[PDB]
Amino acid sequence: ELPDFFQGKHFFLYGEFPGDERRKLIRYVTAFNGELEDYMSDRVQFVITAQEWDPSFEEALMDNPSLAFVRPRWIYSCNEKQKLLPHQLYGVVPQ
Amino acid sequence: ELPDFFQGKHFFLYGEFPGDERRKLIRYVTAFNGELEDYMSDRVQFVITAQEWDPSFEEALMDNPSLAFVRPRWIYSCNEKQKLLPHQLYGVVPQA
């Protein structure tokens, strides 16, 4: 049956995604009981982005210290393993 | 009085640091009421490293999901600003 290891986690897909990769990311997050937000807020816990570190990311953190910025490969890898993998292995950082 | 914005936070300095950087990192963590762990454990919350991502980091995460891996510049920057800055601004991730 369908796994739900994303349960209780709020996602926000940020920026541009090629093709319909946004559609497939929405599907995997939804399938595993994650919750997608239409707008960025303090209720967001994971920002999924294919773009590199944005000056706005630091602004979002000043109100949401627990916020995590992760690559789309985290969602895929969680699907490959059918298991919640650490977001730290796919994080986005200012370099 | 001494500031204590590192209070309740457990650090672990991983790997080699050049010269005496390890001692000054220990100094700033200790001065601001942080606590160093001599070895990795469930108690560790922040792994400070200047080197590449280690294969052991992943195994530490499977028992400790909240683990954060940060660069030494985070310790300096919090000293420069005299305030706890977000670790995400100096985070470390696997490469290549």
Tab-separated table of C-alpha atoms in Angstrom:
chain	number	residue	atom	x	y	z
A	1	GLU	CA	0.000	0.000	0.000
A	2	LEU	CA	0.934	3.661	-0.371
A	3	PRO	CA	3.671	4.850	2.019
A	4	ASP	CA	3.151	8.068	3.964
A	5	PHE	CA	6.624	9.003	5.207
A	6	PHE	CA	6.000	12.636	4.175
A	7	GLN	CA	3.033	12.878	6.559
A	8	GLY	CA	2.724	16.168	8.421
A	9	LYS	CA	5.427	17.821	6.292
A	10	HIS	CA	4.643	21.016	4.370
A	11	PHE	CA	6.438	21.609	1.064
A	12	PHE	CA	6.773	24.572	-1.280
A	13	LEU	CA	8.060	24.228	-4.839
A	14	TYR	CA	10.114	27.352	-5.562
A	15	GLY	CA	11.207	28.841	-8.861
A	16	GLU	CA	11.302	27.308	-12.317
A	17	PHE	CA	11.252	23.589	-13.097
A	18	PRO	CA	11.790	22.225	-16.620
A	19	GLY	CA	9.041	20.505	-18.570
A	20	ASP	CA	6.465	19.005	-16.223
A	21	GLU	CA	8.993	18.102	-13.534
A	22	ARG	CA	6.872	20.314	-11.271
A	23	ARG	CA	3.909	18.038	-11.995
A	24	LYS	CA	5.864	14.901	-11.097
A	25	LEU	CA	7.277	16.470	-7.922
A	26	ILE	CA	3.724	17.406	-6.910
A	27	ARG	CA	2.679	13.797	-7.522
A	28	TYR	CA	5.390	12.182	-5.391
A	29	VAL	CA	4.991	14.645	-2.511
A	30	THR	CA	1.221	14.143	-2.579
A	31	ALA	CA	1.444	10.355	-2.970
A	32	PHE	CA	3.533	9.991	0.199
A	33	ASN	CA	1.089	12.142	2.252
A	34	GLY	CA	3.054	15.379	2.045
A	35	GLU	CA	1.200	18.690	1.930
A	36	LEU	CA	1.973	21.348	-0.676
A	37	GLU	CA	1.509	25.052	0.020
A	38	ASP	CA	0.412	27.479	-2.679
A	39	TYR	CA	2.386	30.342	-1.101
A	40	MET	CA	5.558	30.720	0.930
A	41	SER	CA	4.929	31.145	4.652
A	42	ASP	CA	6.190	30.157	8.093
A	43	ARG	CA	4.144	26.948	7.836
A	44	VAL	CA	6.427	25.777	5.012
A	45	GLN	CA	9.048	23.301	6.229
A	46	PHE	CA	10.822	22.266	3.003
A	47	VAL	CA	11.503	24.491	-0.005
A	48	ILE	CA	12.107	22.394	-3.122
A	49	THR	CA	14.163	24.265	-5.707
A	50	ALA	CA	16.319	23.568	-8.754
A	51	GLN	CA	17.871	27.053	-8.654
A	52	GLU	CA	20.859	27.944	-6.517
A	53	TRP	CA	20.903	29.864	-3.253
A	54	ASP	CA	18.804	33.053	-3.381
A	55	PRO	CA	19.268	36.212	-1.278
A	56	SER	CA	15.576	35.789	-0.414
A	57	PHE	CA	16.345	32.470	1.312
A	58	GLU	CA	18.132	34.305	4.129
A	59	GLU	CA	15.068	36.540	4.496
A	60	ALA	CA	12.739	33.546	4.820
A	61	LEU	CA	15.003	32.066	7.508
A	62	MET	CA	14.815	35.145	9.754
A	63	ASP	CA	11.140	34.313	10.356
A	64	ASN	CA	11.377	30.513	9.906
A	65	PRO	CA	14.593	29.220	11.511
A	66	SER	CA	13.674	25.544	11.016
A	67	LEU	CA	13.318	25.965	7.237
A	68	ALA	CA	15.163	23.515	4.977
A	69	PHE	CA	16.128	24.033	1.322
A	70	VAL	CA	16.355	20.791	-0.654
A	71	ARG	CA	16.880	19.666	-4.252
A	72	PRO	CA	14.270	17.719	-6.257
A	73	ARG	CA	16.570	14.668	-6.215
A	74	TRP	CA	15.606	14.170	-2.557
A	75	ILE	CA	12.009	13.465	-3.588
A	76	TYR	CA	13.129	11.065	-6.323
A	77	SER	CA	15.614	9.247	-4.088
A	78	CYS	CA	12.917	8.862	-1.431
A	79	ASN	CA	10.749	7.320	-4.152
A	80	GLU	CA	13.509	4.976	-5.351
A	81	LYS	CA	13.986	3.668	-1.803
A	82	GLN	CA	10.302	3.987	-0.774
A	83	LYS	CA	11.614	5.520	2.438
A	84	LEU	CA	12.252	8.918	4.005
A	85	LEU	CA	15.905	9.771	3.360
A	86	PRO	CA	17.742	12.632	5.096
A	87	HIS	CA	17.169	15.961	3.370
A	88	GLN	CA	20.706	16.964	4.385
A	89	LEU	CA	22.069	14.651	1.670
A	90	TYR	CA	20.389	16.834	-0.996
A	91	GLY	CA	20.405	20.286	0.583
A	92	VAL	CA	20.873	23.650	-1.102
A	93	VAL	CA	23.530	25.866	0.483
A	94	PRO	CA	25.090	29.243	-0.410
A	95	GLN	CA	28.437	27.561	-1.256
B	1	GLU	CA	28.376	39.214	31.131
B	2	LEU	CA	29.453	36.553	28.639
B	3	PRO	CA	26.851	36.005	25.889
B	4	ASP	CA	25.367	32.525	25.687
B	5	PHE	CA	23.507	32.165	22.387
B	6	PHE	CA	25.088	28.707	21.932
B	7	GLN	CA	23.462	27.480	25.160
B	8	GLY	CA	22.023	23.977	24.956
B	9	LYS	CA	23.711	23.279	21.604
B	10	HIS	CA	26.106	20.336	21.267
B	11	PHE	CA	28.942	20.604	18.744
B	12	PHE	CA	31.388	18.115	17.253
B	13	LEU	CA	34.441	19.296	15.329
B	14	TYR	CA	35.090	16.742	12.586
B	15	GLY	CA	38.308	16.047	10.728
B	16	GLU	CA	41.450	18.131	10.433
B	17	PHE	CA	41.608	21.910	10.809
B	18	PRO	CA	44.667	23.917	9.717
B	19	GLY	CA	47.088	25.376	12.236
B	20	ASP	CA	45.312	26.170	15.503
B	21	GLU	CA	41.852	26.796	14.011
B	22	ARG	CA	40.558	23.865	16.075
B	23	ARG	CA	41.543	25.651	19.293
B	24	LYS	CA	39.893	28.946	18.322
B	25	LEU	CA	36.732	27.135	17.222
B	26	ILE	CA	36.675	25.413	20.623
B	27	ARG	CA	37.212	28.842	22.195
B	28	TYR	CA	34.213	30.491	20.539
B	29	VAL	CA	31.925	27.500	21.116
B	30	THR	CA	32.922	27.391	24.792
B	31	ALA	CA	32.771	31.165	25.329
B	32	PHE	CA	29.138	31.378	24.171
B	33	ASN	CA	27.982	28.474	26.402
B	34	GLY	CA	28.050	25.766	23.746
B	35	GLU	CA	29.131	22.245	24.671
B	36	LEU	CA	31.670	20.145	22.771
B	37	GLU	CA	31.370	16.394	22.373
B	38	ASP	CA	34.610	14.440	22.198
B	39	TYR	CA	33.011	11.777	19.938
B	40	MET	CA	29.940	11.466	17.751
B	41	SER	CA	26.736	10.455	19.504
B	42	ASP	CA	23.001	11.034	19.511
B	43	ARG	CA	23.749	14.100	21.654
B	44	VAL	CA	25.589	15.844	18.799
B	45	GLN	CA	23.497	18.490	17.037
B	46	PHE	CA	26.043	20.314	14.844
B	47	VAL	CA	29.028	18.794	13.034
B	48	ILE	CA	31.602	21.462	12.170
B	49	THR	CA	33.811	20.480	9.245
B	50	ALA	CA	36.100	22.151	6.724
B	51	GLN	CA	36.659	18.948	4.705
B	52	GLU	CA	34.607	16.948	2.222
B	53	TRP	CA	31.405	15.096	3.041
B	54	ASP	CA	32.279	11.911	4.883
B	55	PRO	CA	30.652	8.521	4.253
B	56	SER	CA	30.126	8.288	8.027
B	57	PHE	CA	27.916	11.397	7.957
B	58	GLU	CA	25.121	9.400	6.342
B	59	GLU	CA	25.297	6.631	8.946
B	60	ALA	CA	25.183	9.243	11.710
B	61	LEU	CA	22.010	10.643	10.127
B	62	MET	CA	20.124	7.329	10.148
B	63	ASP	CA	20.206	7.402	13.960
B	64	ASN	CA	20.122	11.223	14.273
B	65	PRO	CA	17.844	12.766	11.622
B	66	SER	CA	18.058	16.311	13.034
B	67	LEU	CA	21.846	16.428	12.546
B	68	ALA	CA	23.217	19.555	10.866
B	69	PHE	CA	26.573	19.803	9.077
B	70	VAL	CA	28.069	23.298	9.032
B	71	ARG	CA	31.256	25.095	7.993
B	72	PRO	CA	33.618	26.789	10.480
B	73	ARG	CA	32.652	30.204	9.068
B	74	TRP	CA	29.335	29.829	10.915
B	75	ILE	CA	31.173	29.978	14.251
B	76	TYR	CA	33.155	33.046	13.172
B	77	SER	CA	30.136	34.835	11.700
B	78	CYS	CA	28.093	34.347	14.872
B	79	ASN	CA	31.045	35.802	16.787
B	80	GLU	CA	31.295	38.766	14.408
B	81	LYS	CA	27.578	39.506	14.822
B	82	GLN	CA	27.479	38.409	18.501
B	83	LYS	CA	24.287	36.487	17.749
B	84	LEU	CA	23.169	33.010	16.704
B	85	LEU	CA	22.911	32.987	12.903
B	86	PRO	CA	21.116	30.293	10.877
B	87	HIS	CA	23.349	27.291	10.240
B	88	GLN	CA	21.688	26.860	6.832
B	89	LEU	CA	23.700	29.846	5.561
B	90	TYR	CA	26.911	27.806	6.023
B	91	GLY	CA	25.686	24.249	5.497
B	92	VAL	CA	27.629	21.324	4.063
B	93	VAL	CA	26.280	18.766	1.579
B	94	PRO	CA	27.687	15.863	-0.449
B	95	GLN	CA	29.546	16.852	-3.604
B	96	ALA	CA	30.767	15.500	-6.957
